[PDB]
């Protein structure tokens, strides 16, 4: 499984 996170962590 791959990491995910809250959207404020990525410019997209």
């Amino acid at each position, epitope marked *: 499984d791959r990491a995910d*996170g809250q959207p404020a962590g990525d410019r997209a």
Partner: antibody
Amino acid sequence: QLQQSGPELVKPGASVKISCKASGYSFTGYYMHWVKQSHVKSLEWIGRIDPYDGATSYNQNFKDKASLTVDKSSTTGFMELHSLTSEDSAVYYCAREGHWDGDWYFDVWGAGTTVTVSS
Amino acid sequence: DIVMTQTPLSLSVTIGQPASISCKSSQSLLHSNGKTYLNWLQQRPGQAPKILMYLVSKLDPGIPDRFSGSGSETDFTLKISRVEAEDLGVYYCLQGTYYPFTFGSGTKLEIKR
């Protein structure tokens, strides 16, 4: 969970690399983020790294100040700060963005590394 | 970047009385995907910050039920139903909707005795 390296005394203009050793979970399944605490009530998010492929994302305020890397073999994350000034003296935290029941949030933190920039 | 404004910046409460902290964001924290990424954190003296709740009001397991959050869009409130001695410290709101993550300036909670 997360074990950060010890306090640092750094000269102005030099650089410093601090580390965060992860244990007891799947290192490559979770983002590692870094946070700056400059005063008693000031927190700034620096950026994050995906330990699986090393992909990074920076707060624009830190894109030149900080460089994030990982070492997959030793399940350790690193933040290097470049060209330090007194404004870089602070406590720096690493945190894991874990997930509970489909949602993600900072669920594990290291105890902090104190960096003192000084001649 | 989203500006997070907390109210008040310091407050003192008697053990057993309620406490409330307000957070206002410069833009609605409602993401296009439906979720509202508002987080509340507590920092005790000498320790790292710790998540209390995420998505406005969802408590991290192991956080006592006396903590609760509410609000929507641009206005959010953290409440402690009955303050305990161990609740002293600094409280932060954190928005995770708009890159980059931004915290508010912390609110310091002191105990009256």
